[PDB]
């Protein structure tokens, strides 16, 4: 027991391939920053992934908000992910019975599993939601994140709900590689912690979003990666905002490491 | 709460325009059956909507599972919904912060808000999920169903969670027209209750789904509408299957009505 670096956690015996790949590039590029690319145009998604790719360890998408999505766009995006070295995380939020989610994960127009290294899912439906996705994810060598806590005001992902998420992730470690949470929720270093609702300044938006700083999230709460969207995208200089958040989240990591 | 027919509730006080339309056609056509058209081909989706249109009060879709989705398909589905008289419910299960769900509800390739009469949402993110959807749905006279309970084993949608779902619906009655539950969770007659996990049996699938009969859900549990998928879809003759479920659920309703 003791805080292990990202690089050491990447080699843990019970580490998942996807999580190991991420941890390795995080340490290599000194970034634990996940950019939330919430844009409506592919060329916009592709432009941002290329420009900020060197500053991030992951790019989170909402492919269903893209007005001109095509599988050729995802092909191009993967080329950028391979080039700049970052994973692709489709924030799809699987939250239905197992029989429906495996279909939403593999088929349809998006064919998410064909290009998403990671996807997340709400635990509210019971473990069937993980077992259904699994059937599609394991063959494709993918990983899954369980939403244990949420950043929004009024969130019901608390107490027993949060504990249920942890037990579910620890019982499906062959596919679940971590959590979407506001702080460390598992004491097993094989699990990744990704925290959204992050900005340098205090505040939030008028539709429920609440913000905490990188030092608070990574340093005081023990999470691993910060997910930032508007904090970077609405800034006049997006590359400088990216670096600021990268250095913010990385230095907080280093401090907690000792 | 004495037991009122669908035709009476449709003329109720705080009754939302959509809920009113739906209850009126239910009474007219003698059907409180919602078809879960879980198929991957637009051609099959449309053919089922045409043949089963007269037997249903609603058609539930999972557009992200349609391999060949286009807005022209929805255009034709709408023509059918108007012809046979049934609402179109997209089981999108919105479950993110408001700023995000409003984009996923309005834009992307699906532009759900443009053709969906109803959509549902998980309450785990907090009321903010309802607020974002509301900004898009209110002017279009759309409605929202809150997922208070779930049909799958291990569901976390219970106790206080379900209570929180009801409070939220009652706090946004201007847009929230009902619930997705296994039974009556609200005593306010203006609120609809739709129940999935239904088959003439009482059984389940290998991925968490659990089944109960129309008599049990509608009659004993006090729900309004049954959402049936495989119990009809897997049949050789789906129309005969739909008619079977229609009479089952209507008679279950006529029984508690007294
Ligand atoms: O609890 C959560 N909070 C979140 O903010 N998110 C996503 O993280 C992103 C945060 O974006 P923001 O612009 O930094 O507020 C956005 O795409 C959300 O949908 C997702 C979950 Br799950
Ligand atoms: O709690 C729930 N249970 C459900 O089964 N559903 C949907 O209802 C449908 C039921 O299909 P079935 O084939 O009758 O099991 C299916 O599309 C589900 O995604 C939706 C909710 Br919300």
Reduced 3-state DSSP string for B38-72:
CCCCHHHHHHHHHHCHHHCCEEEECHHHCCCCCHH
CB contact under 8 A, B38 and A125: no
B20 Cα to the center of ligand 2, angstroms: 24
Beta strands A118-122 and A143-147: pairing type? parallel
Residue among A135, A156, A137 nearest A147 (CA): A156
Residue among B38, B46, B156 nearest A99 (CA): B38
Unique residue bearing structure tokens 């009505």:
B257
Domains and CATH numbers, chain A: 1-258 (3.20.20.70)
Supply the DSSP string of A126-165, one letter for each residue. Answer: -THHHHHHHHHHTTTT-EEEEE---SSTT----THHHHHH
Query: Which residues share a beta bridge with A212?
Result: A198
CA distance A143 to A154: 28
Token pair recorded at residue B220 = 């004993």
Query: Which residues share a beta bridge with B212?
Result: B198
- Using only C-alpha atoms, what is the Rg of chain B? 17
CA distance A135 to A113: 11
Contact in structure between B138 and B174 (CB atoms under 8 Å): yes
CA distance B78 to B136: 19
Token pair recorded at residue B236 = 């050789």
How far, CA to CA in Å, does A170 sit from each of A15, A59, A147? 12, 25, 13
Contact in structure between A34 and A62 (CB atoms under 8 Å): no
The experimental technique behind this entry is X-ray
A173 Cα to the center of ligand 2, angstroms: 26
Find how far residue A105's CA is from the centre of its chain. 16
CA distance A212 to A166: 22
What number of helices (H) and strands (E) belong to chain A? 10, 10
CA distance A253 to A32: 8
Asked if B66 has any chain A CB less than 8 Å from its own CB, the reply is yes
Token pair recorded at residue A116 = 């998403």
Within 10 angstroms of residue A136's Cβ, the number of other Cβ atoms is 21
CA distance A108 to A131: 19
CA-based torsion, A18, A19, A24, A30: positive or negative: positive
Cβ-based neighbours of A216, under 8 Å, separated by 6 or more: none
Return the best residue to mutate from B156, B165, B197 for the ligand 2 pocket (most ligand atoms within 8 A of CB): B197
Token pair recorded at residue B154 = 């291990």
């Amino acid at each position: 027991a003791m805080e292990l670096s990202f690089g050491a956690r990447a080699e843990l015996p019970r580490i998942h391939p996807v999580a190991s790949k991420l941890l390795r590039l995080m340490q290599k590029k000194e970034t634990n920053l996940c950019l939330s690319a919430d844009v409506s145009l592919a060329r916009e998604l592709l432009q941002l992934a290329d420009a900020l790719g060197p500053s991030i360890c992951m790019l989170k998408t909402h492919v269903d908000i893209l007005n001109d999505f095509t599988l050729d766009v995802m092909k191009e995006l993967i080329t950028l992910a391979k080039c700049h070295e970052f994973l692709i995380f489709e924030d799809r939020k699987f939250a239905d019975i197992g029989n429906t989610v495996k279909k939403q994960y593999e088929g349809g127009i998006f064919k998410i599993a064909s290009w998403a290294d990671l996807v997340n899912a709400h635990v509210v439906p019971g473990s069937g939601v993980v077992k259904g996705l699994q059937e599609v994810g394991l063959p494709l060598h993918r990983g899954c994140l369980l939403i244990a806590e949420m950043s929004s005001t009024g969130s019901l992902a608390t107490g027993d709900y949060t504990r249920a998420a942890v037990r579910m992730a620890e019982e499906h470690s062959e596919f679940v590689v971590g959590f979407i949470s506001g702080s460390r929720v598992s004491m097993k270093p094989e699990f990744l912690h990704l925290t959204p609702g992050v900005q340098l300044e205090a505040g939030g938006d008028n539709l429920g979003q609440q913000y905490n700083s990188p030092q608070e999230v990574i340093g005081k709460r023990g999470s691993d990666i910060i997910i930032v969207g508007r904090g970077i995208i609405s800034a006049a200089d997006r590359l400088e905002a990216a670096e600021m958040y990268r250095k913010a989240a990385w230095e907080a990591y280093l401090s907690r490491l000792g």
